[PDB]
Coordinates of C-alpha atoms and ligand atoms in Angstrom, one line a residue:
Chain L
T36 CA -28.2 -74.5 -30.3
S37 CA -31.2 -74.6 -32.3
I38 CA -33.1 -77.6 -34.7
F39 CA -34.7 -77.5 -37.4
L40 CA -37.3 -79.3 -39.3
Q41 CA -35.5 -79.6 -42.8
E42 CA -33.2 -81.6 -40.9
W43 CA -35.5 -84.5 -41.1
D44 CA -35.7 -87.1 -43.5
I45 CA -39.6 -86.9 -42.9
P46 CA -40.2 -83.9 -45.9
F47 CA -42.2 -81.4 -43.7
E48 CA -44.1 -78.9 -45.2
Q49 CA -46.8 -77.3 -43.0
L50 CA -47.8 -78.6 -39.7
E51 CA -51.5 -77.9 -38.2
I52 CA -51.9 -77.5 -34.3
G53 CA -55.6 -79.4 -33.4
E54 CA -57.5 -79.6 -30.0
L55 CA -55.3 -81.0 -26.5
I56 CA -55.6 -84.7 -26.7
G57 CA -54.7 -84.9 -22.5
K58 CA -53.1 -83.3 -19.4
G59 CA -49.4 -84.4 -18.7
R60 CA -46.6 -83.1 -16.7
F61 CA -44.2 -83.0 -19.1
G62 CA -45.0 -80.5 -21.7
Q63 CA -48.9 -80.7 -23.7
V64 CA -49.9 -83.0 -26.5
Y65 CA -52.1 -82.1 -29.2
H66 CA -53.7 -83.4 -32.2
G67 CA -52.1 -82.3 -35.5
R68 CA -52.2 -82.4 -38.9
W69 CA -49.0 -83.2 -41.4
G70 CA -51.8 -87.2 -42.3
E71 CA -52.7 -86.9 -38.8
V72 CA -50.2 -86.3 -35.9
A73 CA -49.2 -86.3 -32.1
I74 CA -47.1 -82.9 -31.7
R75 CA -45.4 -83.0 -28.0
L76 CA -45.0 -78.6 -27.1
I77 CA -42.7 -78.4 -23.9
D78 CA -41.5 -75.4 -22.8
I79 CA -37.6 -74.6 -21.8
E80 CA -35.7 -71.6 -20.3
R81 CA -32.5 -71.4 -22.3
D82 CA -30.3 -72.2 -18.4
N83 CA -28.1 -75.5 -18.4
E84 CA -28.2 -74.6 -21.9
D85 CA -25.5 -77.4 -22.2
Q86 CA -27.8 -80.0 -21.2
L87 CA -30.4 -78.9 -24.3
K88 CA -26.9 -79.4 -26.5
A89 CA -27.3 -83.0 -24.9
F90 CA -30.4 -82.9 -25.7
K91 CA -30.0 -82.3 -29.0
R92 CA -27.7 -85.4 -29.5
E93 CA -29.7 -87.6 -27.5
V94 CA -32.8 -86.3 -30.3
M95 CA -30.8 -87.0 -32.9
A96 CA -30.0 -90.4 -32.1
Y97 CA -33.6 -91.3 -32.0
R98 CA -33.7 -89.8 -35.9
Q99 CA -32.4 -93.4 -36.4
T100 CA -35.3 -95.2 -35.0
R101 CA -38.0 -97.2 -36.7
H102 CA -39.6 -100.3 -35.0
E103 CA -43.3 -101.6 -35.9
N104 CA -43.5 -101.9 -31.6
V105 CA -42.5 -98.4 -31.0
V106 CA -43.8 -95.0 -31.9
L107 CA -42.8 -93.6 -35.3
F108 CA -40.3 -90.4 -34.0
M109 CA -41.3 -87.8 -36.9
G110 CA -39.6 -85.3 -36.3
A111 CA -38.6 -82.0 -33.3
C112 CA -38.2 -78.3 -33.8
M113 CA -36.4 -76.5 -31.9
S114 CA -36.8 -72.1 -30.8
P115 CA -35.9 -72.0 -27.6
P116 CA -38.0 -71.3 -25.5
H117 CA -40.1 -73.8 -26.9
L118 CA -39.8 -77.4 -27.9
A119 CA -41.8 -79.4 -30.2
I120 CA -41.9 -83.2 -30.4
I121 CA -44.0 -84.5 -33.1
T122 CA -44.1 -88.9 -33.0
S123 CA -47.1 -90.4 -35.4
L124 CA -50.4 -90.8 -33.7
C125 CA -51.6 -93.9 -31.4
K126 CA -55.1 -94.7 -32.5
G127 CA -56.9 -96.5 -29.9
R128 CA -57.2 -96.0 -26.3
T129 CA -54.1 -96.7 -23.4
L130 CA -52.9 -99.7 -22.1
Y131 CA -53.5 -98.5 -18.2
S132 CA -57.2 -97.8 -19.9
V133 CA -57.4 -101.2 -21.4
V134 CA -56.9 -102.8 -18.2
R135 CA -59.0 -100.7 -15.9
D136 CA -62.2 -101.4 -18.5
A137 CA -64.8 -104.0 -16.5
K138 CA -66.0 -105.2 -20.6
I139 CA -63.0 -106.1 -21.5
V140 CA -61.4 -109.8 -21.0
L141 CA -57.6 -110.1 -20.4
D142 CA -57.3 -113.4 -20.8
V143 CA -53.5 -114.7 -20.2
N144 CA -52.9 -115.7 -23.8
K145 CA -53.4 -112.5 -25.0
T146 CA -50.8 -111.1 -21.8
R147 CA -48.9 -113.1 -22.6
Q148 CA -49.1 -111.7 -26.2
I149 CA -49.2 -107.7 -24.6
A150 CA -45.9 -108.5 -23.4
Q151 CA -44.3 -110.5 -25.8
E152 CA -45.0 -107.1 -28.0
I153 CA -43.4 -104.4 -25.3
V154 CA -40.5 -106.5 -24.8
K155 CA -39.7 -106.8 -28.7
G156 CA -39.6 -103.3 -28.9
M157 CA -37.9 -102.9 -26.0
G158 CA -35.3 -105.4 -28.0
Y159 CA -35.1 -102.7 -30.2
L160 CA -34.6 -99.7 -28.7
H161 CA -31.8 -101.3 -25.7
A162 CA -30.2 -102.6 -28.8
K163 CA -29.7 -98.8 -30.4
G164 CA -28.3 -98.0 -26.8
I165 CA -31.2 -95.9 -26.0
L166 CA -32.8 -96.3 -22.8
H167 CA -37.0 -95.6 -22.6
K168 CA -36.2 -94.1 -18.1
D169 CA -40.1 -93.9 -17.9
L170 CA -41.9 -97.6 -19.2
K171 CA -45.4 -97.8 -17.5
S172 CA -48.9 -98.5 -19.2
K173 CA -50.0 -95.1 -20.3
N174 CA -47.0 -95.0 -22.5
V175 CA -47.9 -98.2 -24.1
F176 CA -50.9 -98.3 -26.7
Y177 CA -53.0 -101.0 -27.6
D178 CA -55.4 -100.5 -30.5
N179 CA -57.1 -104.7 -31.2
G180 CA -53.9 -106.1 -31.1
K181 CA -51.7 -103.4 -32.3
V182 CA -49.2 -102.5 -29.8
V183 CA -46.6 -99.2 -29.5
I184 CA -44.7 -98.0 -27.1
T185 CA -44.0 -93.9 -26.6
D186 CA -42.2 -91.2 -24.7
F187 CA -39.4 -93.3 -24.9
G188 CA -36.3 -90.7 -23.2
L189 CA -38.2 -88.2 -22.6
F190 CA -37.5 -88.8 -18.7
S191 CA -34.4 -87.3 -18.9
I192 CA -35.7 -84.0 -20.0
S193 CA -37.9 -83.8 -18.2
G194 CA -38.2 -81.7 -15.3
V195 CA -41.8 -83.6 -13.7
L196 CA -40.4 -83.8 -10.0
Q197 CA -39.3 -79.5 -9.6
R198 CA -42.4 -77.9 -2.9
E199 CA -39.3 -76.8 0.3
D200 CA -37.6 -79.9 0.7
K201 CA -40.9 -82.1 -0.6
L202 CA -40.8 -84.4 -3.6
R203 CA -43.8 -84.8 -6.0
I204 CA -44.4 -88.6 -6.7
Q205 CA -47.2 -89.1 -9.2
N206 CA -49.6 -92.5 -7.9
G207 CA -48.2 -95.0 -10.6
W208 CA -43.8 -94.1 -10.7
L209 CA -43.0 -96.1 -7.5
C210 CA -44.1 -98.9 -8.5
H211 CA -42.2 -98.8 -11.3
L212 CA -39.4 -97.9 -9.9
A213 CA -36.1 -100.8 -9.3
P214 CA -34.5 -100.5 -6.1
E215 CA -31.7 -99.1 -7.3
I216 CA -33.1 -96.2 -8.2
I217 CA -35.8 -95.9 -4.9
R218 CA -32.9 -96.0 -2.9
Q219 CA -31.5 -92.8 -4.5
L220 CA -34.5 -90.5 -4.4
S221 CA -34.7 -87.2 -2.4
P222 CA -36.2 -84.0 -2.0
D223 CA -33.6 -82.3 -4.6
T224 CA -32.9 -85.4 -6.6
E225 CA -33.3 -84.6 -10.2
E226 CA -34.3 -87.4 -13.2
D227 CA -30.9 -85.9 -15.2
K228 CA -28.8 -88.2 -12.8
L229 CA -30.9 -91.0 -11.4
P230 CA -29.5 -94.4 -12.1
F231 CA -31.5 -96.0 -15.1
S232 CA -30.0 -99.1 -16.6
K233 CA -31.0 -101.5 -18.8
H234 CA -31.6 -103.2 -15.8
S235 CA -34.3 -100.5 -14.8
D236 CA -36.3 -100.9 -17.2
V237 CA -36.5 -104.7 -17.5
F238 CA -38.2 -104.0 -14.1
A239 CA -40.5 -101.4 -15.1
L240 CA -41.9 -104.2 -17.4
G241 CA -41.8 -106.6 -14.2
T242 CA -44.7 -104.1 -12.9
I243 CA -46.5 -104.2 -16.2
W244 CA -46.1 -108.0 -16.2
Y245 CA -48.1 -108.0 -12.4
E246 CA -50.4 -104.7 -13.8
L247 CA -51.8 -107.5 -16.6
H248 CA -52.7 -109.7 -14.8
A249 CA -53.9 -108.0 -11.4
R250 CA -55.6 -105.1 -13.8
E251 CA -53.7 -102.9 -11.4
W252 CA -50.8 -101.9 -10.1
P253 CA -48.7 -103.3 -7.5
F254 CA -49.0 -101.4 -4.0
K255 CA -51.8 -100.2 -4.5
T256 CA -53.7 -100.6 -1.1
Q257 CA -50.3 -98.4 0.4
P258 CA -49.0 -94.5 0.6
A259 CA -45.5 -93.4 -0.8
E260 CA -43.0 -94.3 2.0
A261 CA -43.9 -97.5 2.9
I262 CA -43.9 -98.4 -0.5
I263 CA -40.2 -96.6 -1.3
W264 CA -38.9 -98.4 2.4
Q265 CA -40.8 -102.2 1.2
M266 CA -39.3 -101.6 -2.5
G267 CA -36.0 -101.1 -1.2
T268 CA -35.3 -103.2 1.3
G269 CA -36.7 -106.0 -1.5
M270 CA -40.1 -106.9 -0.3
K271 CA -42.4 -107.5 -3.4
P272 CA -46.0 -109.5 -4.2
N273 CA -47.0 -112.1 -5.7
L274 CA -50.0 -113.6 -7.8
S275 CA -50.9 -116.7 -5.8
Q276 CA -53.3 -114.6 -4.4
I277 CA -56.0 -115.1 -7.7
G278 CA -54.9 -118.1 -8.3
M279 CA -51.9 -117.3 -11.2
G280 CA -50.0 -120.4 -11.5
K281 CA -45.7 -121.1 -11.1
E282 CA -45.0 -119.9 -14.6
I283 CA -46.3 -116.7 -15.1
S284 CA -45.2 -116.0 -11.2
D285 CA -41.7 -116.5 -11.9
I286 CA -41.7 -113.4 -14.4
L287 CA -41.9 -111.8 -11.6
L288 CA -39.6 -112.9 -9.4
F289 CA -36.7 -112.8 -12.3
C290 CA -38.0 -109.2 -14.1
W291 CA -37.7 -107.8 -9.8
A292 CA -35.2 -109.6 -9.0
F293 CA -33.3 -107.2 -6.5
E294 CA -29.9 -107.7 -7.9
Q295 CA -29.9 -106.3 -11.0
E296 CA -27.2 -108.8 -12.6
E297 CA -30.1 -111.7 -11.2
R298 CA -33.0 -109.7 -14.0
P299 CA -32.6 -111.0 -17.5
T300 CA -32.0 -108.7 -20.9
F301 CA -34.8 -108.4 -23.5
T302 CA -34.1 -111.1 -25.6
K303 CA -33.9 -114.2 -22.5
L304 CA -37.1 -112.5 -21.2
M305 CA -39.1 -113.1 -25.3
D306 CA -37.6 -116.6 -24.3
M307 CA -38.8 -116.7 -20.7
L308 CA -42.5 -115.9 -22.2
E309 CA -42.6 -117.7 -25.3
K310 CA -42.8 -121.1 -23.0
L311 CA -46.0 -120.3 -21.0
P312 CA -48.9 -122.4 -21.7
Chain N
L248 CA -64.2 -89.1 31.1
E249 CA -64.9 -86.2 28.9
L250 CA -67.7 -82.9 30.3
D251 CA -67.5 -79.7 31.5
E252 CA -69.2 -76.3 31.5
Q253 CA -67.6 -73.9 29.1
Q254 CA -66.5 -76.8 26.9
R255 CA -69.6 -77.5 26.2
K256 CA -71.3 -73.4 26.4
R257 CA -68.7 -73.2 22.7
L258 CA -69.6 -76.4 21.2
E259 CA -73.3 -75.1 21.0
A260 CA -72.2 -71.6 20.2
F261 CA -70.2 -73.3 17.1
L262 CA -73.6 -74.7 16.8
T263 CA -75.4 -71.6 16.3
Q264 CA -72.8 -69.8 14.1
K265 CA -73.4 -73.3 11.9
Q266 CA -77.1 -72.8 10.7
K267 CA -75.7 -69.1 9.4
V268 CA -75.0 -70.3 6.2
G269 CA -76.9 -73.4 4.4
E270 CA -74.7 -73.7 1.2
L271 CA -71.2 -72.2 0.0
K272 CA -69.9 -71.8 -3.2
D273 CA -66.5 -69.4 -4.5
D274 CA -68.0 -66.1 -4.9
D275 CA -69.1 -65.9 -1.2
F276 CA -65.6 -65.9 -0.6
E277 CA -63.0 -62.9 -0.3
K278 CA -59.4 -63.8 -0.3
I279 CA -58.2 -62.7 3.2
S280 CA -53.9 -64.7 3.2
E281 CA -52.5 -67.2 2.6
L282 CA -51.1 -69.7 5.4
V283 CA -53.6 -74.5 -0.7
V284 CA -55.1 -73.6 2.5
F285 CA -56.6 -69.8 2.3
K286 CA -57.9 -67.0 5.7
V287 CA -61.4 -66.3 3.4
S288 CA -64.5 -63.9 4.4
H289 CA -67.9 -64.9 4.0
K290 CA -70.1 -62.6 2.6
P291 CA -73.5 -64.5 3.4
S292 CA -72.3 -64.3 7.1
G293 CA -69.1 -62.5 9.0
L294 CA -67.8 -65.8 9.8
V295 CA -64.5 -65.5 8.7
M296 CA -63.2 -69.4 8.2
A297 CA -59.8 -71.4 6.5
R298 CA -60.9 -72.3 3.6
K299 CA -58.4 -75.0 1.9
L300 CA -58.4 -76.4 -1.5
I301 CA -57.4 -79.1 -3.3
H302 CA -56.9 -78.9 -7.1
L303 CA -58.6 -83.0 -8.7
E304 CA -59.2 -83.5 -12.1
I305 CA -62.2 -86.8 -11.9
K306 CA -65.2 -87.4 -12.7
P307 CA -68.7 -86.1 -11.5
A308 CA -70.3 -88.9 -10.5
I309 CA -67.2 -90.1 -7.9
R310 CA -67.3 -86.0 -6.6
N311 CA -70.7 -86.7 -5.6
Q312 CA -69.3 -90.0 -3.4
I313 CA -66.6 -87.3 -2.5
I314 CA -69.2 -85.2 -0.9
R315 CA -71.2 -87.4 0.9
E316 CA -67.6 -89.1 2.7
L317 CA -67.1 -85.6 3.6
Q318 CA -70.2 -84.8 5.2
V319 CA -69.2 -87.0 8.4
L320 CA -67.3 -83.8 9.6
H321 CA -70.7 -82.2 10.1
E322 CA -71.6 -85.3 13.1
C323 CA -67.6 -85.5 14.0
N324 CA -67.5 -82.7 16.3
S325 CA -65.2 -82.3 19.9
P326 CA -63.4 -79.3 21.6
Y327 CA -59.9 -80.8 20.4
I328 CA -60.3 -81.2 16.9
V329 CA -61.7 -78.0 14.7
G330 CA -64.9 -78.0 13.7
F331 CA -66.2 -78.3 10.3
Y332 CA -68.7 -75.5 8.3
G333 CA -68.8 -77.3 5.0
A334 CA -67.6 -78.8 2.0
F335 CA -67.7 -77.9 -1.8
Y336 CA -66.7 -78.3 -5.3
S337 CA -66.1 -75.5 -8.3
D338 CA -63.8 -75.5 -11.0
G339 CA -61.5 -78.2 -10.8
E340 CA -61.4 -77.4 -7.1
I341 CA -62.8 -79.2 -3.7
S342 CA -62.9 -76.5 -0.9
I343 CA -62.8 -78.1 2.9
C344 CA -63.8 -74.7 5.2
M345 CA -63.3 -75.6 9.0
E346 CA -62.3 -72.7 11.3
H347 CA -60.2 -70.6 11.3
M348 CA -57.1 -70.7 14.4
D349 CA -55.4 -67.1 14.7
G350 CA -51.8 -69.6 15.9
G351 CA -51.7 -71.6 12.6
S352 CA -50.1 -75.2 13.1
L353 CA -47.5 -76.0 15.9
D354 CA -44.5 -77.0 13.2
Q355 CA -45.2 -72.6 12.7
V356 CA -45.2 -71.4 15.9
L357 CA -41.8 -74.2 16.9
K358 CA -40.6 -72.5 13.9
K359 CA -41.3 -68.9 15.4
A360 CA -40.0 -69.9 18.8
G361 CA -36.9 -71.9 19.5
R362 CA -38.5 -75.0 21.5
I363 CA -41.3 -75.1 23.4
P364 CA -41.0 -76.0 27.1
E365 CA -42.4 -79.2 28.8
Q366 CA -45.1 -78.0 30.6
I367 CA -47.3 -76.7 27.2
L368 CA -46.5 -79.5 25.3
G369 CA -48.0 -81.7 28.6
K370 CA -51.6 -79.9 27.7
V371 CA -50.7 -80.7 24.0
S372 CA -50.1 -84.7 24.5
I373 CA -53.6 -85.0 26.5
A374 CA -55.7 -82.5 24.1
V375 CA -54.4 -85.1 21.1
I376 CA -54.8 -87.9 22.8
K377 CA -58.5 -87.3 24.0
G378 CA -59.0 -86.4 20.7
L379 CA -58.1 -89.4 19.1
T380 CA -60.0 -91.3 21.9
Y381 CA -63.0 -90.0 20.6
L382 CA -62.7 -90.9 16.9
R383 CA -61.6 -94.4 18.5
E384 CA -65.0 -94.0 20.6
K385 CA -67.6 -92.1 19.0
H386 CA -66.2 -93.0 14.6
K387 CA -63.8 -95.7 14.8
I388 CA -61.9 -94.0 12.9
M389 CA -58.1 -93.4 13.2
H390 CA -56.6 -89.8 12.1
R391 CA -54.1 -92.1 10.3
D392 CA -51.6 -88.2 9.6
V393 CA -50.5 -86.8 13.4
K394 CA -47.7 -84.4 12.9
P395 CA -47.3 -80.7 14.0
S396 CA -48.8 -79.1 10.9
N397 CA -51.8 -81.3 11.7
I398 CA -52.7 -79.6 15.3
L399 CA -53.7 -76.1 15.4
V400 CA -53.6 -72.9 17.9
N401 CA -55.6 -70.4 18.5
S402 CA -55.2 -67.1 20.7
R403 CA -58.8 -68.2 22.6
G404 CA -56.1 -71.4 23.0
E405 CA -57.9 -74.0 22.4
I406 CA -55.4 -76.7 20.0
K407 CA -58.1 -79.0 17.9
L408 CA -56.3 -81.9 15.4
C409 CA -57.3 -81.4 11.1
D410 CA -56.3 -83.0 8.4
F411 CA -57.1 -86.6 9.4
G412 CA -58.2 -89.3 6.7
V413 CA -61.7 -89.9 6.5
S414 CA -63.2 -89.7 2.3
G415 CA -60.8 -93.2 1.2
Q416 CA -61.9 -91.9 -2.5
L417 CA -60.4 -89.0 -2.1
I418 CA -56.8 -90.1 -0.6
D419 CA -57.0 -92.5 -3.9
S420 CA -58.1 -89.8 -6.2
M421 CA -55.6 -87.1 -5.4
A422 CA -53.1 -87.5 -8.7
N423 CA -50.2 -87.3 -6.4
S424 CA -48.3 -87.3 -2.8
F425 CA -45.8 -85.5 -1.4
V426 CA -42.9 -86.5 0.3
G427 CA -40.2 -85.4 1.8
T428 CA -37.2 -85.1 4.2
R429 CA -39.4 -85.9 8.1
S430 CA -41.1 -88.6 8.3
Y431 CA -44.0 -89.5 10.8
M432 CA -45.3 -92.8 9.9
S433 CA -45.1 -95.7 12.9
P434 CA -42.4 -98.4 12.2
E435 CA -45.8 -100.8 11.4
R436 CA -47.1 -99.0 8.7
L437 CA -43.7 -98.1 7.4
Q438 CA -43.7 -102.2 6.7
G439 CA -47.4 -102.2 5.0
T440 CA -48.8 -104.7 8.3
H441 CA -51.6 -103.8 10.1
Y442 CA -52.0 -100.7 12.2
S443 CA -54.2 -99.3 14.9
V444 CA -54.1 -95.8 17.3
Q445 CA -50.9 -97.1 17.7
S446 CA -49.4 -95.3 14.8
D447 CA -51.3 -92.5 15.6
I448 CA -49.4 -92.8 19.3
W449 CA -45.8 -93.2 17.5
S450 CA -46.7 -89.9 15.5
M451 CA -47.4 -87.9 18.7
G452 CA -44.8 -88.9 20.7
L453 CA -41.4 -88.4 18.1
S454 CA -43.9 -84.9 17.2
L455 CA -43.5 -84.0 20.7
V456 CA -39.8 -84.7 21.2
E457 CA -39.1 -82.7 17.6
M458 CA -40.8 -79.6 19.5
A459 CA -38.9 -80.5 22.8
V460 CA -35.6 -80.4 21.4
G461 CA -36.2 -77.7 18.2
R462 CA -35.0 -80.4 15.8
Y463 CA -36.4 -83.6 13.6
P464 CA -34.4 -86.5 15.7
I465 CA -33.6 -88.5 13.1
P466 CA -31.1 -89.2 12.6
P467 CA -30.0 -88.0 16.3
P468 CA -27.7 -85.4 16.5
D469 CA -24.3 -85.7 17.6
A470 CA -22.4 -84.8 21.4
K471 CA -21.5 -81.7 20.1
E472 CA -25.1 -80.2 18.1
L473 CA -26.7 -81.1 21.6
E474 CA -24.4 -79.1 23.3
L475 CA -24.7 -75.9 20.4
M476 CA -28.5 -76.2 21.3
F477 CA -28.3 -76.1 25.1
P478 CA -28.0 -85.1 2.7
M479 CA -29.9 -88.2 3.6
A480 CA -31.7 -90.1 0.8
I481 CA -35.8 -90.7 1.8
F482 CA -35.1 -94.4 2.2
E483 CA -32.3 -94.3 4.5
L484 CA -34.6 -92.1 6.8
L485 CA -37.4 -94.3 6.7
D486 CA -34.9 -97.7 7.2
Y487 CA -33.3 -96.1 10.1
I488 CA -36.5 -95.3 11.3
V489 CA -37.6 -99.0 11.0
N490 CA -34.2 -100.5 11.8
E491 CA -32.9 -98.1 14.6
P492 CA -33.6 -96.9 18.2
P493 CA -36.0 -94.9 18.3
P494 CA -35.4 -91.0 19.7
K495 CA -35.1 -90.7 22.7
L496 CA -35.1 -87.4 24.6
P497 CA -31.8 -85.6 26.5
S498 CA -32.0 -87.3 30.1
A499 CA -30.4 -84.3 32.1
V500 CA -33.1 -81.1 30.8
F501 CA -36.1 -83.2 31.0
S502 CA -38.4 -84.6 34.0
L503 CA -38.5 -88.6 34.3
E504 CA -42.5 -88.5 33.5
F505 CA -41.9 -86.6 30.6
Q506 CA -38.9 -89.1 28.9
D507 CA -41.2 -91.8 30.0
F508 CA -44.1 -90.5 28.5
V509 CA -41.8 -90.6 24.8
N510 CA -40.2 -93.3 25.4
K511 CA -43.6 -95.5 25.6
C512 CA -44.8 -93.4 22.5
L513 CA -42.0 -95.2 20.7
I514 CA -41.7 -98.3 21.2
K515 CA -41.4 -100.3 17.9
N516 CA -43.2 -102.8 18.6
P517 CA -47.0 -101.7 18.7
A518 CA -48.8 -104.4 21.4
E519 CA -45.8 -102.7 23.9
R520 CA -46.2 -99.4 22.8
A521 CA -48.8 -97.5 25.2
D522 CA -52.5 -97.2 24.0
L523 CA -54.6 -94.4 24.3
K524 CA -55.7 -95.4 28.2
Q525 CA -52.5 -95.9 29.3
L526 CA -51.8 -92.9 28.3
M527 CA -54.4 -90.5 29.8
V528 CA -52.9 -92.9 33.1
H529 CA -49.5 -91.7 33.0
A530 CA -48.3 -89.7 35.9
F531 CA -47.2 -87.4 33.2
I532 CA -50.3 -86.2 31.8
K533 CA -52.6 -86.0 35.3
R534 CA -49.4 -84.0 36.8
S535 CA -49.8 -82.0 33.6
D536 CA -53.6 -81.6 33.9
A537 CA -53.5 -80.0 37.1
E538 CA -51.0 -77.1 36.7
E539 CA -52.2 -73.2 36.0
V540 CA -49.8 -72.8 32.6
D541 CA -51.7 -69.7 30.4
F542 CA -51.1 -71.2 27.1
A543 CA -52.7 -68.1 25.1
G544 CA -50.6 -65.9 27.0
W545 CA -47.6 -68.2 25.9
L546 CA -48.8 -67.9 22.6
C547 CA -50.0 -64.6 21.9
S548 CA -45.9 -63.0 24.0
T549 CA -44.1 -65.5 21.6
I550 CA -46.2 -65.0 18.4
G551 CA -47.6 -61.5 18.7
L552 CA -51.2 -61.5 19.4
Ligands
LIG238 N1 -48.8 -90.9 -29.8 C1 -50.0 -90.3 -29.2 N2 -51.1 -91.1 -29.8 C2 -52.4 -90.6 -28.7 N3 -52.4 -90.4 -27.6 C3 -51.2 -89.4 -27.2 C4 -49.8 -90.5 -27.3 N4 -48.5 -89.6 -26.7 C5 -49.2 -89.2 -25.9 N5 -50.9 -89.3 -25.8 C6 -51.1 -89.3 -25.2 O1 -51.4 -87.6 -24.1 C7 -51.6 -87.6 -22.9 C8 -50.4 -86.8 -22.7 O2 -48.9 -88.0 -22.2 P1 -48.3 -88.3 -21.4 O3 -46.9 -86.8 -21.6 O4 -47.3 -90.0 -21.9 O5 -48.2 -88.3 -20.1 P2 -48.7 -89.2 -19.2 O6 -47.7 -90.2 -19.2 O7 -48.5 -89.0 -17.8 O8 -50.0 -90.1 -19.6 C9 -52.0 -88.6 -22.1 O9 -53.1 -88.6 -22.5 C10 -51.8 -89.1 -23.9 O10 -52.1 -90.2 -23.6
LIG239 N1 -57.1 -73.5 10.4 C1 -56.3 -73.6 9.5 N2 -56.3 -72.8 10.5 C2 -55.0 -71.8 10.4 N3 -53.6 -72.6 9.3 C3 -54.4 -73.3 8.8 C4 -55.6 -74.5 9.3 N4 -55.3 -75.2 7.9 C5 -54.1 -75.1 7.5 N5 -53.4 -74.3 8.2 C6 -51.4 -73.6 7.3 O1 -51.9 -75.1 6.0 C7 -50.2 -74.9 6.5 C8 -50.5 -76.7 7.0 O2 -50.5 -77.2 4.9 P1 -52.1 -78.5 4.8 O3 -52.8 -78.3 3.7 O4 -52.2 -78.6 6.4 O5 -51.3 -79.6 5.1 P2 -50.0 -79.9 5.4 O6 -50.6 -79.7 7.2 O7 -49.6 -81.4 5.4 O8 -48.9 -79.0 5.6 C9 -49.6 -74.5 7.9 O9 -49.6 -73.3 7.1 C10 -51.2 -74.2 8.7 O10 -50.7 -72.9 8.9
LIG240 MG1 -45.4 -90.8 -21.8

């Protein structure tokens, strides 16, 4: 019913909490000292206490993860109503900020390479049987060639949706959701029971691949309802209008495929990305 | 097309109350009640206004651009559009201060009343058409968000449109949108194609049937639910709107002019859908315009003022 910090393989003596790093829908994310570290404080009341036990076992699952392209999960302590998830701190800025920086060139080769790193990390997580469930550019960090995935798995326990008969959509969320998921959304749909899958994670990567070249999300113009219907019936943009080649547009065509089984696994996707010019 | 004496008066009477303040800031206001939008008391000047606060965290340079876009509201003024007093920024919230409408929105009045009768809905149709015509002809702007919650009423008996999309940056600067179970978006807009005021006309038509029958009409009720009156995912509704035939009014209890009016508004092909000028000439509104209805009296007696 509780998670202590000496359960963990990282020897932990003291933990200093510093300044807030940023605003976020799921908990607060502070700077910390252990080396310096990143601490995410979340609060759960205690209701659905069988969900926290399920959460506990998924966290202990995280304990067995270690991979150069995956943020280092270092520990978690749960003293309800208060929870804390402690991961390594990522130097640099988020990929979202990088691609939206005019003063940073993103040649085709660089984008191939960034994508390949994300694919390696996600292939690792899949192999361990772990779905990210919220792959996006704000959850990937890039510091001069070092690419790390962040906040995998959190979305399940998150509760970021919570008005009366009206579901909260954040700006970038919809365009990362595969059609299977979009067709499910409803004002009382909940993250715990949404049909996430390995294929949905591949779809989200596909969105990131569009974002890498357009330097903006797909369906930027359009409102949420338009996006729900267009993505549900399978309508998807291409990159020709900025002059990108067939090779790197087939990537989207494969990753965004309407039928889940047509989407590659991450290992096959790694192959496909190796073969660009 | 638009002219009147008593209508000219209150605009200017507003434009006298206009100058009764020059600048606005948070401490000028005392919270009167909750309608997020608040009824507020202004102290520099005795006017009671509605102050809406939009929570936004963005850098000053964008905020100053936002204010220049919202300043256009000082330029648009019409007897069918809620008057605007000013917009300021303070402590993470943009304030939009406008005329307080003592009847609230048409959704909440509909909530109180059982159904709204045809004759009021005729006057509502004219006011919406002429308000939308004004923005097209004078400002080259579409509303983009016509629905019952954005049509306001008062005890003097005026009905005016609000919450339209004047600021492209404010729309984009908002982090998160709220999509629920009722949608008033036109088919063409849902498919991401080119759209015009025709989409506003669809929204008006669908809003009118909802208020006339007392229920959001997609999906249509079954036979036995229409008798009693007299679990669906968001994508199912939207695809229903795009592919199934539009809602229609029951053919017993409403005039042919009213049924034809909504039908012309809800034609799915926007090229065939009625335009503002054709609506102005439809039998239903010309008939409605020449009618003696105490709208204030209807409102006050059903709501309780
Ligand atoms: N390991 C980390 N290193 C540095 N900053 C982080 C780390 N993890 C999260 N953050 C920051 O904390 C804030 C909260 O992020 P998150 O919870 O992922 O919300 P979002 O995905 O909406 O940004 C973000 O500004 C993010 O940049
Ligand atoms: N000028 C106004 N006078 C009276 N009530 C208002 C006014 N503006 C907004 N409201 C109230 O605000 C609520 C509508 O919320 P709003 O912020 O306008 O978004 P939406 O119209 O999409 O719901 C309604 O209950 C309505 O009564
Ligand atoms: Mg995150």
